[PDB]
Ligand binder design. Structure first.
Ligand code: SF4
Length: 64
């Protein structure tokens, strides 16, 4: 079991990840920034490539 999430707080003005995860990553009006709105929204291989993108990443996994 391996989960994850992101620090939309460090999210800039790009959607590179959202493109590699148009279901888990998605900016919000409350966070005015992309965030793992649903770890099941994207797959780990999509969440992976989406992790490579991003300037400082600001994304990480969530064991257990
Ligand atoms: S790739 Fe990084 S900077 Fe671009 S929206 Fe996703 S979280 Fe934000």
């Amino acid at each position: 079991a391996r989960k994850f999430y992101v620090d939309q707080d460090e999210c800039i003005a790009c959607e590179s990840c959202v493109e590699i995860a148009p279901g888990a990553f998605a900016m919000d009006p409350e966070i005015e920034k992309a965030y793992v709105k649903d770890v099941e929204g994207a797959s780990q291989e999509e969440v992976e490539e989406a992790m490579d993108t991003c300037p400082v990443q600001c994304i990480h996994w969530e064991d257990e």
